[PDB]
Amino acid sequence: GLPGMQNLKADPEELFTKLEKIGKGSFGEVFKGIDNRTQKVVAIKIIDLEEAEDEIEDIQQEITVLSQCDSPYVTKYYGSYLKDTKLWIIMEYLGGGSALDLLEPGPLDETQIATILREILKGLDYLHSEKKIHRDIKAANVLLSEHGEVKLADFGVAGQLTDTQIKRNTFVGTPFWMAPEVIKQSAYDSKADIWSLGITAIELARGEPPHSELHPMKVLFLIPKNNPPTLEGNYSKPLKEFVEACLNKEPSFRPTAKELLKHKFILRNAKKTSYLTELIDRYKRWKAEQ
Numbered sequence: 027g028l029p030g031m032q033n034l035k036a037d038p039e040e041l042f043t044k045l046e047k048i049g050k051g052s053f054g055e056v057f058k059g060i061d062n063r064t065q066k067v068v069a070i071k072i073i074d075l076e077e078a079e080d081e082i083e084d085i086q087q088e089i090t091v092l093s094q095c096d097s098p099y100v101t102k103y104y105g106s107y108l109k110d111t112k113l114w115i116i117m118e119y120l121g122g123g124s125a126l127d128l129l130e131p132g133p134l135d136e137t138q139i140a141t142i143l144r145e146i147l148k149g150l151d152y153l154h155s156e157k158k159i160h161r162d163i164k165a166a167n168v169l170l171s172e173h174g175e176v177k178l179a180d181f182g183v184a185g186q187l188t189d190t191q192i193k194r195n196t197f198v199g200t201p202f203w204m205a206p207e208v209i210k211q212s213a214y215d216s217k218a219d220i221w222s223l224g225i226t227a228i229e230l231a232r233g234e235p236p237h238s239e240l241h242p243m244k245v246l247f248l249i250p251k252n253n254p255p256t257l258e259g260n261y262s263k264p265l266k267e268f269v270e271a272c273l274n275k276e277p278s279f280r281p282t283a284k285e286l287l288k289h290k291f292i293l294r295n296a297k298k299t300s301y302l303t304e305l306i307d308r309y310k311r312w313k314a315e316q
Contacts, residue, residue: 028086029093030105030116038107038114042070053081054112058119061104068104069119076111084182089115091158091184099149101169101179120177122170122306125226129165129233131312136265138305139230140295142168143268145176146223147292150283153178154216159185159194163222164203165229174302187215194218201242202235206250207277217277220286224272228257231265250275264291 042059049056054073061068073085092103104116125142128134134142146168153160160167160181167180183198193213199205205221207214225235236255237245254273257266268291274280286292 028089028106030089030103032105032107034108036107038070038109038112041107042068042114042116044070053078053085058121061116067119067121069117071115071117073113073115074111075113085113085115088180088182088184091181091186092117095153095156095158097149097152098175099145099152099177101177118177120169120175120179121172122174122302123309124166124179125168125170125176125230126165128170128305128309129230131308133233134230134305136231136262136291137295137297138302139227139265140292141297141299141302142176142230143223143227144287144292144296145299146178146226147283147287149176149178150216150219150223151287153184154219154283157187159187159216160219160222161185162199162203163219164200164226164235168226170302170306172303172306174299174306176299176302201245201249202238203229204249205277206275209246210250214277216282217280220272220280220283221274221277223283223286224269224280225255227265227269227272228255231257231261232259262291264289264294267291 041062043062044057044059046058047055048058054071057070059068059070075082089103089106092101101120102118106116107114160178161183162180167178169177169179185194187194193215195211195213197208197211199208203222203225205214205218208218229235237248254275257269268289271281271286271289
């Protein structure tokens with residue numbers, strides 16, 4: 027029931043060569059490796075199935091959604107293989123790290139912020155046209171290639187607004203970045219992603235989302251209660267207005283990803299993506315210490 031899945035005869039230990047461990051979340055581990063067949067780098071995510079339970083349903087969800095997307099803005103999925111009780115998930119490798127990782131060394135300038143936002147808006151636009159909802163937009167889920175290309179990853183809880191289900195009600199996402207109607211489990215759609223993008227715009231500018239120091243439960247009542255967050259500090263007027271456009275409590279009043287692509291903040295500051303390699307190296311130097 028998992029697209030891309032290979033019978034047990036496909037031995038992943040022989041088909042792929044792990045090069046190094048690049049992540050160890052809570053589902054398992056991630057390696058940079060090589061498809062020995064086509065000799066190309068891939069990210070290899072291994073989850074122990076005999077050691078995970080409820081997380082399986084989310085992993086299968088993610089793979090299903092990734093299998094249906096074909097966009098240079100969404101991480102590609104290459105297939106899955108099974109080894110004993112280990113599911114190996116083969117994915118597009120993005121070696122530049124996440125936008126959250128690129129924040130570790132210091133602040134981004136507005137050009138970088140605009141460039142990264144423009145690319146995220148491209149991915150959102152594709153998804154929304156395909157009637158898909160990301161549902162977990164935030165800087166840790168925006169990944170970069172080593173040359174600066176920007177992609178959406180980790181849908182996990184991505185929604186599908188199809189024919190007989192025009193709206194979603196599921197309380198899903200990470201609190202700080204969740205739209206108010208998602209918390210209130212109201213019927214919602216792509217606009218929940220636009221709100222999340224506004225919270226991620228504050229995150230790329232200040233490093234953390236609003237209320238990041240409060241306990242999550244308090245945040246559950248603050249978002250629907252309080253006025254929408256605003257970007258405070260010395261940022262240009264268009265950056266603060268981009269944030270306000272996204273953060274409207276009324277979802278149907280937030281603009282589409284396509285219209286935000288014409289926003290003055292984006293038009294005046296975004297530059298080619300290759301300019302992001304600088305930000306990418308800063309991160310490498312930084313992590314080299316540590």
